[PDB]
Amino acid sequence: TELTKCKVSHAIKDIDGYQGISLLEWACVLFHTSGYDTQAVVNDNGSTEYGLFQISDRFWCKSSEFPESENICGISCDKLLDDELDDDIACAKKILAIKGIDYWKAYKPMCSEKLEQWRCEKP
Amino acid sequence: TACPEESPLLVGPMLIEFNIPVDLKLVEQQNPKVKLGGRYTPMDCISPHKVAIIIPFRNRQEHLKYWLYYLHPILQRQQLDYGIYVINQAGESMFNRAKLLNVGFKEALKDYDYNCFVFSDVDLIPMNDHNTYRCFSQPRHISVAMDKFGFSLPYVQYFGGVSALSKQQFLSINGFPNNYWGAGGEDDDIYNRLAFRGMSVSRPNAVIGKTRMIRHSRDKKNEPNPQRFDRIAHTKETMLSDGLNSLTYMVLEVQRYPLYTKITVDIGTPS
Numbered sequence: 107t108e109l110t111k112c113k114v115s116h117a118i119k120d121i122d123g124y125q126g127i128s129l130l131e132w133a134c135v136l137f138h139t140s141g142y143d144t145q146a147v148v149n150d151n152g153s154t155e156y157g158l159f160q161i162s163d164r165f166w167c168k169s170s171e172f173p174e175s176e177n178i179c180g181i182s183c184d185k186l187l188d189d190e191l192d193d194d195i196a197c198a199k200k201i202l203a204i205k206g207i208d209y210w211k212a213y214k215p216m217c218s219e220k221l222e223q224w225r226c227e228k229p
Numbered sequence: 230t231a232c233p234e235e236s237p238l239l240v241g242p243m244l245i246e247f248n249i250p251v252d253l254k255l256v257e258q259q260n261p262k263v264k265l266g267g268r269y270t271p272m273d274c275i276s277p278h279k280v281a282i283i284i285p286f287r288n289r290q291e292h293l294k295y296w297l298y299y300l301h302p303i304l305q306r307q308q309l310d311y312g313i314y315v316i317n318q319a320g321e322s323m324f325n326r327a328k329l330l331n332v333g334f335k336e337a338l339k340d341y342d343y344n345c346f347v348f349s350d351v352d353l354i355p356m357n358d359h360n361t362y363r364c365f366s367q368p369r370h371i372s373v374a375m376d377k378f379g380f381s382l383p384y385v386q387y388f389g390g391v392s393a394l395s396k397q398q399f400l401s402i403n404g405f406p407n408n409y410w411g412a413g414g415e416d417d418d419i420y421n422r423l424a425f426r427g428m429s430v431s432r433p434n435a436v437i438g439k440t441r442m443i444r445h446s447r448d449k450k451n452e453p454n455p456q457r458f459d460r461i462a463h464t465k466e467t468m469l470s471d472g473l474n475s476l477t478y479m480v481l482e483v484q485r486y487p488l489y490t491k492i493t494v495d496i497g498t499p500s
């Protein structure tokens with residue numbers, strides 16, 4: 107499903123301010139990371155990144171390619187391809203707590219300035 | 230005897246649909262003034278806009294048909310002295326949009342002394358003819374309001390889809406990069422290059438710039454480029470070593486159709 111900025115901002119409300127990252131920054135990050143597509147599947151190198159947050163099966167979630175992957179998030183990668191973002195968010199938090207915002211390659215180059223544009227002015 | 234600042238032929242909002250199949254023969258019949266190779270020059274006045282329209286391409290013939298169907302009458306209404314160039318990427322390596330656009334610049338200039346270049350994806354059709362396909366004081370971003378993004382700019386730094394740079398503005402940034410293979414990033418790098426040269430971005434408003442995109446599937450061999458985020462972070466340096474100055478390519482064939490010129494080139498493989 108291809109969500110909208112506002113739909114995303116609302117959905118990930120609970121991650122706001124975590125690790126010092128605002129919703130504006132996330133809205134920016136997620137657009138560039140997966141274009142707000144909850145079913146995005148990309149093959150970064152030898153691994154695959156899943157969903158809206160593009161969580162990789164290299165270490166974070168468990169897929170068929172990486173059977174003995176760390177699966178640090180303790181979840182099947184397929185659960186990151188639905189429209190229930192609560193488990194994608196929880197996994198994002200663990201990544202923020204362990205690796206930090208830099209896991210999201212788009213953050214530094216595309217979301218270091220002009221963040222106000224990413225604000226959802228919807229009630 | 231020089232064309233008016235604003236064309237008197239403009240109609241404004243247009244109905245853009247992609248359901249009726251197109252027949253280039255009809256399009257040609259409907260566009261008598263267009264000469265071999267997709268060239269046109271108004272007969273009344275003299276146009277100061279010598280425009281070469283470059284379209285990066287590989288296996289998008291159906292889209293090209295619609296593009297030609299809609300753009301030709303529009304470009305004439307805009308009173309431009311233009312030429313249509315479809316830069317076809319031979320082979321099956323990862324698609325390189327920016328390099329192909331560079332080739333179009335070079336190749337086009339051999340045919341005529343264009344002073345303006347409009348770089349356009351094959352699937353974007355403007356919805357208002359007031360959205361002139363020409364150059365301005367500053368680099369012009371044309372597809373500012375795509376349906377794909379709710380008729381709004383996806384992000385203020387966006388310079389993708391359809392944009393134009395005068396010959397001076399283009400040489401100014403050493404053209405575009407050639408090192409971006411696969412989808413994503415190249416357009417942001419180009420945007421970065423404009424900034425690192427005091428140049429800003431000109432744009433029509435969100436209504437005059439509404440644009441329709443022919444929906445399609447992700448083409449084979451155009452998967453997101455893994456290193457696109459690292460690359461856009463070092464544009465200030467790489468732009469000096471990656472551009473027109475370093476462009477190399479082998480033209481395999483030049484085709485002149487009545488509505489456009491298709492140049493098939495071998496642009497090598499990713500380094």
Ligand SMILES: O=c1ccn([C@@H]2O[C@H](COP(=O)(O)OP(=O)(O)O)[C@@H](O)[C@H]2O)c(=O)[nH]1
Binds near residue numbers: 286351352412
């Ligand atoms: O296999 C391909 C990939 C891309 N393109 C051209 O490159 C543009 C940009 O590609 P795409 O539409 O896939 O990019 P997106 O806008 O959807 O990111 C297209 O409009 C085409 O003009 C093409 O002709 N063949």
Ligand SMILES: CC(=O)N[C@@H]1[C@@H](O)[C@H](O)[C@@H](CO)O[C@H]1O
Binds near residue numbers: 138139389412416
């Ligand atoms: C670094 C990157 O991926 N930038 C892309 C850009 O190439 C693309 O034109 C635009 C619209 O789809 O979305 C951005 O996220």
Ligand SMILES: [Ca+2]
Binds near residue numbers: 185189194
């Ligand atoms: Ca989920």
Ligand SMILES: [Mn+2]
Binds near residue numbers: 350352442
């Ligand atoms: Mn497209």
